[PDB]
Point group: D2
Chain length 144, copies 4
Amino acid sequence: PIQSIKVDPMKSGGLGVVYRSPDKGRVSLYLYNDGEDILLVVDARFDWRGEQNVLVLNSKFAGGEWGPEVRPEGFPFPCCGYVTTITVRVEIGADGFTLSANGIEIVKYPYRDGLPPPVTKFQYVFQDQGASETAQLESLSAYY
Amino acid sequence: PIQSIKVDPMKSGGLGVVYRSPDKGRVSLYLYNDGEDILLVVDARFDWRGEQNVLVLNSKFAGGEWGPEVRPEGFPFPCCGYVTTITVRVEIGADGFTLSANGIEIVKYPYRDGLPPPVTKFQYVFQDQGASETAQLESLSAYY
Amino acid sequence: PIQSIKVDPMKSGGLGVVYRSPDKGRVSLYLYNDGEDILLVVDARFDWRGEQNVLVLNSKFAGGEWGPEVRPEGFPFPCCGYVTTITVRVEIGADGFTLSANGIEIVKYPYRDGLPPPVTKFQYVFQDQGASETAQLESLSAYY
Amino acid sequence: PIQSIKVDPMKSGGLGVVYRSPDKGRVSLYLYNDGEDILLVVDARFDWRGEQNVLVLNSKFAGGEWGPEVRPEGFPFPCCGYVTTITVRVEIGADGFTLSANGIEIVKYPYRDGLPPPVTKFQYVFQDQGASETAQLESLSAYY
């Protein structure tokens, strides 16, 4: 339900996950530095806490407040309680991350204050919410 | 909006397509014999004539009449008016076709009476209906 | 050992093939137009009539003779009579063809004159010369 | 020229890398446990210490010594000092390691005594030897 790859500090390239989505719950992908700061989470909510089919990006110093939430449109949530294979890319640009889902670009997210790369750890987290079709991690990938 | 590939009478293997879904309209795929009987239409309705997000499968003799509709669930329609890249795979067994979309099998469909293989033609067709983002075809593939 | 995909006249995009190579014999690819002109042959000669691991491109009007042969370095022939899976890609540019194998560019081949696009037939041919491990076709693709 | 991904204790699935091959030198792939044993090394020697196109598999206790060298045939070494893109796959199976390159399985390797999984680190080490075309890493991936 939780799996991660720990990389040599990364200032370039990108990161990919592929997983089978759930009908209920949420899938989180965290980018961490060494000091355990959250440089970025892409938080994909299918059914999480009274929210359905919403995507959230944010950031956070270790033990400190989340910034302003970014709520982009375009994320391939499936209709009607359906599950599919999701493929995501987070490319580490000079000025921000770029988030792609299934080969279509979703958003450019400029680095938050004092939260630039390097990235050292890229984590996958599925949190259930009485889901009948649970999520399945398929692959994790570092790009060079 | 209409494009197709023609094969050596194919009794085995499978067939694939990759396309950017529209937000309104419908995307259909047609597998023909040489006399142009429709051995199978995998028909994807994004917004068609009152129906939203429904998949219809059927067959038909060249200018005869459509058989029963099968409407299976699990096809990767996106929520909220969103578009994604979709991938379809129709596999050619001994006894029927198999449908995979985005890595996941959707239905096994036995051949209808007097409509067995081979396939000689495989055809992508997109039919608009005031789409704000129209479908874009990306590839067509035959597998051996 | 021979397979093809016919398309509606194609003036852009690319065509793609995957095969498992042989240790003897040649595997060759043909881009025909409606008039049955060879707009391009891409001829991988593993061991064939006294030539080992040589790639030859050419064109040749339906009937007429061949023109200048072309033999570029780069083609991923395996050592020591081993075989492997191989992926080739031919793109239809504005003034020429770009040929790629295994995501690496092999040659820009400028269109021979009076012999430009459209392309309506792409075709794999395996011709054997006593191979122990024999070629095998895996896919043929049209790109839009 | 040296990049790793560290993982949880991994006991099934696989691990793939993708590189553009060098013309001279070697590309080694190490699978370490947490006690820094080499559970398996996969050593593509393109031109290294007077040996041309040789694959050595082996294992080794941390600061102990090597084992008997396995040397399988069939590694997709390019002829003639040409470089190409190699994909490799190492599966962590029940009774052993299954090696694969370009979708074609190359050999099995039973876990050596006192040298079984979990894996915790997968490492890519390019070590040059006056190469013309230098190896370039493309991706590292974990498989679940």
